[PDB]
Design a protein around this ligand. Sequence first.
Ligand SMILES: *[C@@H]1O[C@H](CO)[C@@H](O[C@@H]2O[C@H](CO)[C@@H](O[C@@H]3O[C@H](CO[C@H]4O[C@H](CO[C@H]5O[C@H](CO)[C@@H](O)[C@H](O)[C@@H]5O[C@H]5O[C@H](CO)[C@@H](O)[C@H](O)[C@@H]5O)[C@@H](O)[C@H](O[C@H]5O[C@H](CO)[C@@H](O)[C@H](O)[C@@H]5O)[C@@H]4O)[C@@H](O)[C@H](O[C@H]4O[C@H](CO)[C@@H](O)[C@H](O)[C@@H]4O[C@H]4O[C@H](CO)[C@@H](O)[C@H](O)[C@@H]4O[C@H]4O[C@H](CO)[C@@H](O)[C@H](O)[C@@H]4O)[C@@H]3O)[C@H](O)[C@H]2NC(C)=O)[C@H](O)[C@H]1NC(C)=O
Ligand SMILES: *[C@@H]1O[C@H](CO)[C@@H](O[C@@H]2O[C@H](CO)[C@@H](O[C@@H]3O[C@H](CO[C@H]4O[C@H](CO[C@H]5O[C@H](CO)[C@@H](O)[C@H](O)[C@@H]5O)[C@@H](O)[C@H](O)[C@@H]4O)[C@@H](O)[C@H](O[C@H]4O[C@H](CO)[C@@H](O)[C@H](O)[C@@H]4O[C@H]4O[C@H](CO)[C@@H](O)[C@H](O)[C@@H]4O[C@H]4O[C@H](CO)[C@@H](O)[C@H](O)[C@@H]4O)[C@@H]3O)[C@H](O)[C@H]2NC(C)=O)[C@H](O)[C@H]1NC(C)=O
Ligand SMILES: *[C@@H]1O[C@H](CO)[C@@H](O[C@@H]2O[C@H](CO)[C@@H](O[C@@H]3O[C@H](CO)[C@@H](O)[C@H](O[C@H]4O[C@H](CO)[C@@H](O)[C@H](O)[C@@H]4O)[C@@H]3O)[C@H](O)[C@H]2NC(C)=O)[C@H](O)[C@H]1NC(C)=O
Ligand SMILES: *[C@@H]1O[C@H](CO)[C@@H](O[C@@H]2O[C@H](CO)[C@@H](O)[C@H](O)[C@H]2NC(C)=O)[C@H](O)[C@H]1NC(C)=O
Ligand SMILES: *[C@@H]1O[C@H](CO)[C@@H](O[C@@H]2O[C@H](CO)[C@@H](O)[C@H](O)[C@H]2NC(C)=O)[C@H](O)[C@H]1NC(C)=O
Ligand SMILES: *[C@@H]1O[C@H](CO)[C@@H](O[C@@H]2O[C@H](CO)[C@@H](O)[C@H](O)[C@H]2NC(C)=O)[C@H](O)[C@H]1NC(C)=O
Ligand SMILES: *[C@@H]1O[C@H](CO)[C@@H](O)[C@H](O)[C@H]1NC(C)=O
Ligand SMILES: *[C@@H]1O[C@H](CO)[C@@H](O)[C@H](O)[C@H]1NC(C)=O
Ligand SMILES: *[C@@H]1O[C@H](CO)[C@@H](O)[C@H](O)[C@H]1NC(C)=O
Lengths: 211, 231, 301, 53
Amino acid sequence: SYVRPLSVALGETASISCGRQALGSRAVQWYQHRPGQAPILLIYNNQDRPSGIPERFSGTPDINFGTRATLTISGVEAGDEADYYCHMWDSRSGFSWSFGGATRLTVLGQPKAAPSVTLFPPSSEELQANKATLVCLISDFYPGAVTVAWKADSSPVKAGVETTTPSKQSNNKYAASSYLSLTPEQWKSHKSYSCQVTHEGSTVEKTVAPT
Amino acid sequence: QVQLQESGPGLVKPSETLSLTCSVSGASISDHYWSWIRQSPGKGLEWIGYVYDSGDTNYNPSLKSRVNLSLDTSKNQVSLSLTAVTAADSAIYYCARTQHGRRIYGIVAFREWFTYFYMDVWGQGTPVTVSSASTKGPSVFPLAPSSSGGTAALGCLVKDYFPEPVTVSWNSGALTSGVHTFPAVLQSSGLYSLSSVVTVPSSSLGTQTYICNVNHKPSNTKVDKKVEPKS
Amino acid sequence: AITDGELKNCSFNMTTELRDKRQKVHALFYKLDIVPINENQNTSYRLINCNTAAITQACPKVSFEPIPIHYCAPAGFAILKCKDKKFNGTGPCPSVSTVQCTHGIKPVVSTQLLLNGSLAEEEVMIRSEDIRNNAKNILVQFNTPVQINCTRPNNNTRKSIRIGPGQWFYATGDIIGDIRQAHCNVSKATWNETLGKVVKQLRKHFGNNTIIRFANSSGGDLEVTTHSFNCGGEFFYCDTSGLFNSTWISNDSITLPCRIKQIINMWQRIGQAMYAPPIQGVIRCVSNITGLILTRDGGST
Amino acid sequence: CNTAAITQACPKVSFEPIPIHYCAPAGFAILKCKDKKFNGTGPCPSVSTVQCT
Ligand SMILES: *[C@@H]1O[C@H](CO)[C@@H](O[C@@H]2O[C@H](CO)[C@@H](O[C@@H]3O[C@H](CO[C@H]4O[C@H](CO[C@H]5O[C@H](CO)[C@@H](O)[C@H](O)[C@@H]5O[C@H]5O[C@H](CO)[C@@H](O)[C@H](O)[C@@H]5O)[C@@H](O)[C@H](O[C@H]5O[C@H](CO)[C@@H](O)[C@H](O)[C@@H]5O)[C@@H]4O)[C@@H](O)[C@H](O[C@H]4O[C@H](CO)[C@@H](O)[C@H](O)[C@@H]4O[C@H]4O[C@H](CO)[C@@H](O)[C@H](O)[C@@H]4O[C@H]4O[C@H](CO)[C@@H](O)[C@H](O)[C@@H]4O)[C@@H]3O)[C@H](O)[C@H]2NC(C)=O)[C@H](O)[C@H]1NC(C)=O
Ligand SMILES: *[C@@H]1O[C@H](CO)[C@@H](O[C@@H]2O[C@H](CO)[C@@H](O[C@@H]3O[C@H](CO[C@H]4O[C@H](CO[C@H]5O[C@H](CO)[C@@H](O)[C@H](O)[C@@H]5O)[C@@H](O)[C@H](O)[C@@H]4O)[C@@H](O)[C@H](O[C@H]4O[C@H](CO)[C@@H](O)[C@H](O)[C@@H]4O[C@H]4O[C@H](CO)[C@@H](O)[C@H](O)[C@@H]4O[C@H]4O[C@H](CO)[C@@H](O)[C@H](O)[C@@H]4O)[C@@H]3O)[C@H](O)[C@H]2NC(C)=O)[C@H](O)[C@H]1NC(C)=O
Ligand SMILES: *[C@@H]1O[C@H](CO)[C@@H](O[C@@H]2O[C@H](CO)[C@@H](O[C@@H]3O[C@H](CO)[C@@H](O)[C@H](O[C@H]4O[C@H](CO)[C@@H](O)[C@H](O)[C@@H]4O)[C@@H]3O)[C@H](O)[C@H]2NC(C)=O)[C@H](O)[C@H]1NC(C)=O
Ligand SMILES: *[C@@H]1O[C@H](CO)[C@@H](O[C@@H]2O[C@H](CO)[C@@H](O)[C@H](O)[C@H]2NC(C)=O)[C@H](O)[C@H]1NC(C)=O
Ligand SMILES: *[C@@H]1O[C@H](CO)[C@@H](O[C@@H]2O[C@H](CO)[C@@H](O)[C@H](O)[C@H]2NC(C)=O)[C@H](O)[C@H]1NC(C)=O
Ligand SMILES: *[C@@H]1O[C@H](CO)[C@@H](O[C@@H]2O[C@H](CO)[C@@H](O)[C@H](O)[C@H]2NC(C)=O)[C@H](O)[C@H]1NC(C)=O
Ligand SMILES: *[C@@H]1O[C@H](CO)[C@@H](O)[C@H](O)[C@H]1NC(C)=O
Ligand SMILES: *[C@@H]1O[C@H](CO)[C@@H](O)[C@H](O)[C@H]1NC(C)=O
Ligand SMILES: *[C@@H]1O[C@H](CO)[C@@H](O)[C@H](O)[C@H]1NC(C)=O
């Protein structure tokens, strides 16, 4: 149905149990899936790792029945965090069409990264189009949990605010963006506009003003 | 060295015949297996069916009635058809090369062996959104640099459009350093909006003629725009 | 589950210790021990014996392994042992000795194939009551023993379900592990060699040169058609078509399919059937195939 | 009921012990130790023979 969560300390090995355990002799495939990217299989036949896969990942070989197919990851790092699927093929069960229930691996102890905020005033061409949008961009922040509050001078806006949920980038840090839709007259009236981003206990504010 | 490319429409009306195509470059299509997998947000990836090299086919029991596969011998293309699409059928579609596996646990003569498949090579995947909404072209507005030394920030804005995705390049892909394309945001209006910024040195700023190249396949629109400081 | 079943998963209600209470239990059974109660067909089954005779469960402590038994005669009587190597069925035995008790004779109940018996010395022996008459069987005794390995790979389990005050019924517990069927192995080299030595002694009674073929059993059913025997407590029934499938004129081990039953009526017993309690774990027994029991097809050839 | 079955003792048979004499067959004999102070085991100085106890 939905994903089951797993948490591991950074740099310490971890074992991923496999749901729907086998009834007879089995050949298991372990797939690594990142949101939005193509799944990469780590183990095609229990202990067989295709070329290019690091030696840190390993799986249990069904030499004597009664063993439980598990996925062992040594030196757990940021890149390991992902969803892992256990495709089961046992002798008793029939054709296994569905993959296993997802297993969300999270890496604890990751170093926090301060967010890099960049506020952009509306373009002149957008103002000619009789529309205005303030664009607040947040990059390279971990953990990926931020709150965005806009303000005008002092007052908070609280209206016309649209923010993306944080998404992981190739840097293994998150990236989020917020958009404030405004009318060109409202952009010229106020003295300045501020984007406030709160990450953990810290808060960073950037300001832009009309020319 | 095998590469797969999935070319899909990206948008299809509900209750219509969705179709895709899986081009292959590594090896011939008559020597391996070809399987399609779809992944939707909030749901686990789903194996829908593989393609023989000859090209009998089996399909997942859930979608067995609405899916039809086919393999072209003249062109290394694996085509997937799907009827009566709905909002649920929208998801990212992959096509991977599947290999045959034979697990022997008893005496071969009395059966006692099952075939197990595994896909070692995957494609990049093409998204497909199913909705009655029409296509919408993106409005591109340049973001002027903010003007310590010598880092500077400029970029472009891609206003409301539909549907995903949008490809952004700079100088026709001439610049790759300091390029960060943020994920889009879905507004209540029902159109996505994304930004793309580039970090360049203050110096260089003046003048290097930075131009962002935008492309929206469903809208059939490819747009370029210049970015330069404003007084 | 499986697509395109010798054993079946059966549920049914059985009495408990208390007369008023009942219990529902599930136990695995073999196809041979059960018949459908409908044939129309629905799918309610019953035990194969309930229609003909009652049934009793063999106590779990007693063992079915044959041990050497010596038959003795009382004082005033004696037993004469014929020590003639080449001694055929009947006739005058030149070398005779006297003993009070016979050698260690194991009561191995088998069919088709003789197991754990005593090997004939010198040449292999062909013994019959009337070689000219096809109706009478043919006893064969090997000089060199062939080896046969029978196994039940399934890791069965014993389910002890009480069916009354003191009464205990031992049902099969779901199998643990793969589902494989029992089978015996025989070395094709030794069996082809041993079978060739048999045809040489066979031609001594059917002409120094003649066509000698071998086919599978085509008469009777159940016990007479399969190499039935016991092994660790489970009763095997093997198809011997692979062994008697040749034609003679002028390490690649053979395999035999074996099916199992738990309800049996041995020695043509009419009125009493026995339920062999399941044997826990994997079963494997290595036995000696020392003799055979053949029969001609007859006809006007 | 949980362990073993049960049977009702017939009402006519009585459980009162009556004197029983254990006899040995012809060719055998029973030796009775008539030593008053005779302990468990050991040599019995005074011995007699009887066919039944
Ligand atoms: C009476 O008579 C009967 C008839 O004669 C007789 O029947 C026999 O019964 C026995 C059991 O009772 C059966 O034994 C099993 O046989 C299996 C298969 O063995 C053969 O095939 C495999 C696979 O061959 C393919 O793969 C290899 C490996 O890469 C390739 O090199 C080959 O080229 C081949 O690939 C081609 O062919 C494929 C088609 O199959 C194609 O798909 C492919 O594309 C290619 O074209 C070989 O590995 C075997 O060789 C090795 O083993 C044999 C047997 O021991 C040795 O003699 C030989 O020297 C080699 O060492 C052989 O050729 C066995 O796999 C099986 O053992 C597995 O299963 C058991 C239980 O399930 C496990 O406990 C055990 O651990 C084994 O599992 C391992 O392997 C699987 C799959 O690889 C893994 O998923 C698993 O995790 C585990 O991995 C571990 O072991 C690996 C190697 O063992 C190791 O690499 C790993 O690192 C890890 O440690 C079992 O032995 C036998 O098949 C019957 N025979 C017949 C003819 O029916 C009966 O026994 C007789 N006896 C009686 C009655 O008493
Ligand atoms: C033709 O002749 C052939 C030549 O003999 C025959 O081949 C014979 O085949 C039979 C099977 O049909 C074999 O019998 C079974 O063998 C099993 C495997 O033996 C292994 O274990 C041995 C244990 O070692 C002990 O004994 C050896 C003997 O020398 C001794 O050296 C050693 O020190 C140790 O004391 C080992 O020696 C062997 O090498 C093997 O590795 C064996 O397990 C079987 O025993 C079972 O089953 C029999 C019959 O069912 C019972 O009488 C036994 O008591 C025992 O049952 C108990 O143990 C089971 C183990 O799982 C349990 O499941 C049972 O429930 C039961 O447990 C209860 O009782 C226990 C004792 O009271 C309690 O402690 C428990 O708590 C429980 O209450 C069985 O012997 C022969 O071995 C094999 N022959 C040879 C030479 O190997 C062939 O069958 C013949 N063909 C025909 C058609 O007749
Ligand atoms: C399965 O079949 C094989 C087929 O050979 C069988 O192996 C043989 O068993 C016999 C016993 O039945 C063995 O013979 C004995 O061996 C012992 C130990 O070496 C000797 O002490 C014995 O000597 C005497 O007894 C003989 C009669 O058995 C007399 O002829 C002789 O004068 C002596 O008094 C006797 O030779 C024989 O050695 C083995 N064969 C081999 C190669 O080991 C095996 O026993 C069978 N299995 C079962 C479970 O029955
Ligand atoms: C076993 O050998 C004896 C030889 O002593 C056979 O006895 C003779 O058998 C023939 C026919 O087979 C008869 O014509 C003779 O009259 C028999 N002689 C005696 C003294 O009875 C015996 O038939 C052989 N048995 C088998 C089954 O071959
Ligand atoms: C048959 O299955 C039983 C399980 O019922 C196995 O017995 C277990 O063996 C493991 C060893 O791997 C032990 O850790 C367990 O404690 C055992 N459990 C019981 C209940 O016995 C047995 O090993 C299996 N035999 C075969 C040949 O596969
Ligand atoms: C039956 O099983 C026995 C033993 O389980 C087999 O004897 C083995 O034979 C091999 C040669 O193939 C030897 O290497 C082993 O040492 C033998 N083991 C023992 C215990 O003697 C025998 O070959 C099997 N027969 C068949 C037909 O499979
Ligand atoms: C088992 O017993 C219950 C209660 O007596 C009864 O309703 C049910 O039909 C029985 N089922 C079978 C399969 O005998
Ligand atoms: C005997 O052999 C025939 C093949 O000619 C086969 O169809 C039949 O099932 C066999 N029957 C027995 C009892 O072995
Ligand atoms: C007999 O052997 C032949 C030739 O190998 C084979 O085709 C046939 O299936 C065998 N029949 C039986 C009953 O084993």
